[PDB]
Amino acid sequence: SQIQFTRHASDVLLNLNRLRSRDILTDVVIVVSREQFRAHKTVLMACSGLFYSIFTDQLKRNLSVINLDPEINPEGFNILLDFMYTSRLNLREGNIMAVMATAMYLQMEHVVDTCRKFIKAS
Amino acid sequence: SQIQFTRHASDVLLNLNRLRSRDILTDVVIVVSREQFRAHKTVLMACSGLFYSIFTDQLKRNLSVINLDPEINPEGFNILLDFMYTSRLNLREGNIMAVMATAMYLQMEHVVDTCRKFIKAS
Numbered sequence: 001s002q003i004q005f006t007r008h009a010s011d012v013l014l015n016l017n018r019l020r021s022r023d024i025l026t027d028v029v030i031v032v033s034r035e036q037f038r039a040h041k042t043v044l045m046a047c048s049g050l051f052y053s054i055f056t057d058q059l060k061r062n063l064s065v066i067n068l069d070p071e072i073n074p075e076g077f078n079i080l081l082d083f084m085y086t087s088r089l090n091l092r093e094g095n096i097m098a099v100m101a102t103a104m105y106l107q108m109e110h111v112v113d114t115c116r117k118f119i120k121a122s
Numbered sequence: 123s124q125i126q127f128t129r130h131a132s133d134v135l136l137n138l139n140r141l142r143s144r145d146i147l148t149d150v151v152i153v154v155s156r157e158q159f160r161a162h163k164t165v166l167m168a169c170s171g172l173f174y175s176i177f178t179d180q181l182k183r184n185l186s187v188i189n190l191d192p193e194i195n196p197e198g199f200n201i202l203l204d205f206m207y208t209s210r211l212n213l214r215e216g217n218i219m220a221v222m223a224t225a226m227y228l229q230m231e232h233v234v235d236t237c238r239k240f241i242k243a244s
């Protein structure tokens with residue numbers, strides 16, 4: 001019965017990315033080797049099984065700094081964080097493996113599934 | 123060049139609504155007459171010119187309680203908050219006027235514009 005705004009979700013995500021771009025209401029720093037990335041936990045939780053599981057745990061939910069696995073590649077992480085906030089995944093031959101393995105670690109199964117299709121599409 | 127996930131934004135919004143439903147990482151209470159509504163400021167800012175303007179102001183950005191104009195109808199507010207988090211607007215003859223006037227106050231111009239089309243479509 002309700003009216004559907006078909007661009008509203010993407011508009012929200014776009015604005016949330018603009019907020020990240022300005023460091024407005026970001027509440028966590030993700031450290032990946034020597035790089036740091038600020039983000040909104042709510043967005044992370046919405047997009048990643050690893051961050052969902054971390055922050056739903058009232059023991060961890062107020063963490064302000066998350067140190068990721070040192071083996072994780074920051075470029076892979078950065079590509080996935082961009083994806084979270086934009087719905088666009090920058091998959092390329094030079095990065096498919098680091099992205100796929102990072103998406104496995106972050107428990108982003110649709111992305112991993114898409115990464116497999118990409119290998120299969122060559 | 124990048125791969126577009128066409129359902130990702132709506133999936134994010136759906137998960138953010140589930141987080142609200144569980145009061146996970148909500149950081150503001152909106153008081154409207156005798157009713158209270160918890161929400162995420164980031165979502166509010168993304169969807170409303172009034173909340174954007176309030177919370178971008180470093181003077182107001184850490185407010186945990188916002189008292190809205192007492193004349194605002196809580197049902198109208200509640201319909202608009204649901205819309206923010208779902209992209210579905212529950213517009214009905216019994217509520218078009220309270221929704222439109224609430225959307226004016228919250229500076230949700232596409233919604234106001236849509237409310238006018240609704241009156242014109244009768």
Ligand SMILES: O=C(Cn1ccc2c(=O)[nH]c(NCc3ccccc3)nc21)Nc1ccncc1Cl
Binds near residue numbers: 046048107110140141
């Ligand atoms: O679903 C998410 C995060 N997420 C995104 C893709 C994706 C994924 O592929 N596998 C997982 N495995 C862990 C898990 C599985 C089901 C629900 C929750 C977590 N998790 C993912 N978060 C969420 C769920 C329900 N309510 C609010 C929120 Cl924020």
Ligand SMILES: O=C(Cn1ccc2c(=O)[nH]c(NCc3ccccc3)nc21)Nc1ccncc1Cl
Binds near residue numbers: 168230
């Ligand atoms: O646009 C919004 C909020 N919003 C949603 C619909 C809507 C609206 O119809 N009129 C207004 N008038 C005030 C305004 C006008 C332009 C930008 C910002 C505020 N504001 C709206 N927020 C935002 C913008 C840029 N970067 C990050 C964010 Cl969160």
Ligand SMILES: [Cl-]
Binds near residue numbers: 024026
């Ligand atoms: Cl801030």
Ligand SMILES: [Cl-]
Binds near residue numbers: 147
């Ligand atoms: Cl919480």
